[PDB]
Design a protein around this nucleic acid. Structure first.
Length: 179
DNA sequence: GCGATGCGGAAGAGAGTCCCCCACCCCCTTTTATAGCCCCCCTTC
């Protein structure tokens, strides 16, 4: 195909293995914001990795915004150290990547009306609700947002192989509905 | 003094022609790409 999707966002969850005091973290953490009325977690941001992480009292933390697997793990470790630097016994346990978001362009307009007809079992095109066709691939459990402009967004992948594999499967299908 | 009762008359049926408590699930939130749609404020004259 000659086109490789580029990851736009990765969601990874890591357990620190120790209960944390959310109020204490907000007071001392540099960028943390805690609003129990709004959300029950502590939202923190670190610019150099350019990622955002949510910290819960149970010790589990979710890291989002990383553009690569290495960045997500590095960003998650940095957040854990910040909590550890606050006097808590934070660790890096069962780090896992929960979601990978990738985007790409096929460089040609797509006839979404034709695509849904031939793939009604997997496609879902509702212009009233969303201007982009939602494709649910089965062999890889990846949900693809195909747009008339040609932009394709892949999400729900656990590994980078699924993102590339999913695009390889849909690209020939899109080529058959080129506008 | 101290009770006790049958019959006529009236009545009446009966037939014919809401508020609370206890699971279970969804959304609150964050990140990102995509794009049409639409609110809101601004600006124009």
């Amino acid at each position: 195909s000659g086109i490789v999707p580029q990851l736009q966002n990765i969601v990874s969850t890591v357990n620190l293995g120790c209960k944390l005091d959310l109020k204490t973290i907000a007071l001392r953490a540099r960028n943390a914001e805690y609003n129990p009325k709004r959300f029950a977690a502590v939202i923190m941001r670190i610019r150099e990795p350019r990622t955002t992480a949510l910290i819960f009292s149970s010790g589990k933390m979710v890291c989002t915004g990383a553009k690569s697997e290495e960045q997500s793990r590095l960003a998650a470790r940095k957040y854990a150290r910040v909590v550890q630097k606050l006097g808590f016994p934070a660790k890096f346990l069962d780090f896992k990547i929960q979601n990978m978001v990738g985007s790409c362009d096929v460089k040609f307009p797509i006839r979404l009306e034709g695509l849904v007809l031939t793939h009604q079992q997997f496609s879902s095109y509702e212009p009233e609700l969303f201007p982009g066709l939602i494709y649910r691939m089965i062999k890889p459990r990846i949900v693809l947002l195909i747009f008339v402009s040609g932009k394709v967004v892949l999400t729900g992948a656990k590994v980078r192989a699924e993102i590339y594999e999913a695009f390889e499967n849909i690209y020939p299908i899109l080529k058959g509905f080129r506008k």
